[PDB]
Design a protein around this ligand. Structure first.
Ligand SMILES: Cc1cc2nc3c(=O)[nH]c(=O)nc-3n(C[C@H](O)[C@H](O)[C@H](O)COP(=O)(O)OP(=O)(O)OC[C@H]3O[C@@H](n4cnc5c(N)ncnc54)[C@H](O)[C@@H]3O)c2cc1C
Ligand SMILES: Cc1cc2nc3c(=O)[nH]c(=O)nc-3n(C[C@H](O)[C@H](O)[C@H](O)COP(=O)(O)OP(=O)(O)OC[C@H]3O[C@@H](n4cnc5c(N)ncnc54)[C@H](O)[C@@H]3O)c2cc1C
Ligand SMILES: Cc1cc2nc3c(=O)[nH]c(=O)nc-3n(C[C@H](O)[C@H](O)[C@H](O)COP(=O)(O)OP(=O)(O)OC[C@H]3O[C@@H](n4cnc5c(N)ncnc54)[C@H](O)[C@@H]3O)c2cc1C
Ligand SMILES: Cc1cc2nc3c(=O)[nH]c(=O)nc-3n(C[C@H](O)[C@H](O)[C@H](O)COP(=O)(O)OP(=O)(O)OC[C@H]3O[C@@H](n4cnc5c(N)ncnc54)[C@H](O)[C@@H]3O)c2cc1C
Ligand SMILES: C[C@H](Sc1nnc(O)[nH]c1=O)C(=O)O
Ligand SMILES: C[C@H](Sc1nnc(O)[nH]c1=O)C(=O)O
Ligand SMILES: C[C@H](Sc1nnc(O)[nH]c1=O)C(=O)O
Ligand SMILES: C[C@H](Sc1nnc(O)[nH]c1=O)C(=O)O
Lengths: 217, 217, 217, 217
């Protein structure tokens, strides 16, 4: 299932290893691989989360395919405890696809030009930049030099493999009102997928370990 | 499938995410999820491996359950780019299970006592240590203090989650004649499992990137 | 300065890069390298710590030389975000040096044998194990096989390089009453050294980010 | 000492812990802290490097202050085993400073427009983008939204703390002809600083472990 984000972005879960019971089996180092035992297994998940013993959650791993603007992916790729592979503008021609904020993005700010004209000015400069990029590529300038004139709102795409512990750290920092609005919108989508795949771990994280201010209520 | 190792140890693969095509899809950042394309896909695997572009292989992840003596697990747990959860002797009573080397373990060494008597002397001291451990536990000494008299050949067990890149590094260093014989035997089992699960990546690693001296021939 | 710990262990700081002002300079990405500005600089340290923006503290790094029993170093070396180099019993003959708990270590536990006799039983088994180790080494058994009969209370030594962020994580988990008493004693020494070298960061950590129950009061 | 790089960038070493003898002391776990012993100490450095036992080099750490264009820092920040703190365009107004390639940058490429006109077209679009950025900031658009129209050749600055092992990995991959020319120029400067600070380790790395094709001759 692809979740759409911003005007042209998305997050899609591509693969997953493990579930809530992976963490309990790892915590106990279990020989037995039987079915769910809600009461016992949820209490252990909560105990782990309540005490900060979160290494067992490293045994649940996700791989996502994300399409986001470069300024969002720069913040995302600061999360070092993860694996990333991104589309390179050294080797491929980059598509004309840019994030243009909605006039609502400026809610709460008083400006001396209308919000619709801000939107138009952004659209205008990114069209001029893309025209220069394509003029340089079609004149024989190597892609890795021509691409440096493109703006930070160009969309890129990457695959991200991350375990549930590092993904909880990502939600603490990016599903939170101090994070920039655009990456919050991605962190809300990732949280919805994590909740679907690992409901006990997700509920325990919100009750005991989640440090942000958006996911609770 | 559990592979037996040493006298009482084992390695068992518990879960796996991804396969050879996970690495090619990540390297290309592919939208398409079609079937194997041997020729193209193997060449890209080899190119990546030949040039040291190994981040795509981080998207293939394995979880193993391992039973090994403490002196082997101490060497194993030096591999930091992985996740481990081990059985704790603070919280559980530890089983009477020790690695006793076969008289063949001393092949090539001239000793002043017969190899069968070395085996017997090891058996004897570990029986005396275990008897002291149990004497202290049954007198009310806390487990976390009583266990300090047990020797390094006691078996322990742990779950290990590792991606294919870190597992190639583990094979470079532990499937190699400079590593201690006992952990080589574990690295040979892990290599057999990796070869079964990811044959193109495994064959490419042996041809281009494997630095050890045991897996080739 | 070497701080003694347990009966024969120690922690000694060998080298340090940076101080509290390293973290403020990194947080601001400062061109200027002037002297302390207590008021401004302490407030920024507190703000960082209060909000969990702890990457600036990664720019302060310490190297320690530690002598500890093997069962303490096994818990220590679970901290993956650090560098370790340990003395190997494959390549050197290991010294007769073991941790023997004081009769006070059993304070609060009712036992069926006197605490002085527990101490004596531990001393006795480690002497028997060391005698077997030396008997095997002097008969020509290779060190890497003979050492497996030594108990977990043998002392080892290692160098540990760690930045201030990872060292705060180590104190959260090891300077705390749920950690085993022996590693608490090491974490208290490391905390004293960190406080001497980085007083503003240390005081800010206790006020806002320290999760344990021993360092405060 | 600041080394200038490109038209307006630089690399400057801000702090360093350790030297070649830090690695030998860590490898031996030495109690003694005496002076250089060239013959013995260089042979051990070479042996470590020749066999891939590079953990001792993690005990030498550097902190650099780097000013580079965003497209170079995006490649740089893929190196996860390091610490970074960068100037944020959410919180500060960004300076009008862009990398404009010299007409020599296109050596070897046949183009349908003169190389001097490529230079002029780049200058022109970045001036138009900066004018839009400043128009939005002075109309009251928040900085974190206005900055998304700036191109990837805007310069940024960051502090990078890295140990000598991770810095050898960085040189293997970035001091090499497959890396983009602009980051090669930064990797050549970093190599010159590493050679000055750690000459035996640097010479051993070139002789045995350096995988690139630029630093040797
Ligand atoms: C609101 C906000 C403002 C920000 N402002 C800036 C800014 O102005 N400039 C800037 O450069 N960045 C800024 N960042 C980025 C921030 O500094 C972190 O790089 C990013 O949040 C990733 O967090 P992390 O280090 O915890 O994650 P990861 O890198 O995924 O690390 C996960 C955990 O592993 C541990 N860890 C990983 N590597 C190390 C290491 N080498 N040493 C010690 N522990 C380690 C730490 O416990 C860490 O929490 C900001 C982030 C937020 C959310
Ligand atoms: C034959 C042999 C003899 C040994 N002898 C000793 C000994 O006497 N004493 C001793 O203490 N250990 C010894 N070791 C352990 C060895 O020092 C390593 O700790 C172990 O081999 C793990 O290797 P690693 O660091 O590459 O793996 P990981 O820790 O899994 O790291 C994987 C890769 O990530 C990178 N990396 C991870 N963390 C860091 C970091 N903080 N800085 C820079 N790069 C990082 C490096 O590229 C590393 O190769 C020996 C190992 C072998 C095989
Ligand atoms: C009281 C107590 C009881 C314990 N009991 C057990 C037990 O029974 N069995 C057991 O096996 N261990 C046990 N441990 C060890 C514990 O599981 C951790 O391994 C140890 O505390 C190191 O913590 P850490 O992972 O936070 O530190 P590090 O490994 O130094 O990591 C620092 C931070 O980096 C991040 N990080 C590093 N690597 C990863 C990764 N691969 N994925 C995601 N994040 C990462 C996390 O933010 C982490 O907090 C116990 C520890 C304590 C204190
Ligand atoms: C010529 C060139 C072309 C490139 N093209 C692309 C591209 O098209 N797209 C793209 O996304 N990137 C590309 N890269 C970036 C490349 O994929 C690496 O991200 C970058 O080179 C950092 O290398 P590293 O992972 O070895 O370094 P670090 O991230 O510093 O890791 C150091 C070492 O630690 C180990 N390590 C660290 N974290 C992990 C982990 N989670 N799992 C296993 N081992 C780990 C590995 O041994 C690693 O070598 C390219 C780089 C080069 C030089
Ligand atoms: C270079 C920084 S990194 C950073 N800056 N602010 C955030 O909120 N998150 C981040 O990761 C930026 O986006 O301006
Ligand atoms: C403490 C060291 S660590 C180590 N020593 N030698 C190895 O061959 N591998 C390792 O990891 C040991 O086993 O003696
Ligand atoms: C194998 C585990 S690891 C561990 N166990 N309990 C702790 O308190 N700390 C740890 O790191 C042990 O010491 O028994
Ligand atoms: C997004 C990628 S990352 C990368 N791409 N090519 C490189 O040579 N180095 C890199 O790190 C880029 O710069 O286009």
């Amino acid at each position: 299932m692809k979740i759409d984000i911003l005007d042209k972005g998305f997050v899609e879960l591509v693969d997953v290893m493990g579930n809530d019971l992976s963490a309990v089996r790892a915590a106990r180092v279990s020989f037995d691989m039987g079915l769910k035992d809600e009461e016992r297994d949820r209490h252990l998940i909560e105990y782990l989360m309540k005490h900060g013993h979160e290494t067992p959650f490293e045994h649940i791993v996700f791989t996502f395919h994300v399409k986001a603007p470069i300024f969002v992916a720069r913040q995302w790729f600061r999360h070092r405890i993860a694996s990333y592979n991104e589309l390179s503008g050294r080797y491929s021609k980059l598509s004309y696809e840019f994030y243009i904020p909605s006039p609502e993005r400026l809610e709460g700010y008083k400006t001396t030009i209308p919000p619709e004209r801000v939107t138009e000015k952004i659209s205008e400069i990114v069209d001029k930049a893309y025209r220069t990029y394509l003029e340089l590529i079609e004149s024989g300038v190597p892609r890795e030099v021509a691409r440096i004139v493109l703006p930070l709102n160009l969309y890129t795409r990457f695959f991200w493999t991350v375990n549930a512990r590092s993904l909880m750290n990502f939600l603490n920092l990016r599903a939170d009102s101090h994070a920039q609005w655009e990456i919050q919108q991605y962190a809300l989508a990732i949280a919805r997928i994590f909740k679907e795949k690992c409901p006990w771990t997700f509920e325990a994280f919100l009750k005991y370990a989640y440090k942000g201010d958006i996911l609770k209520e």
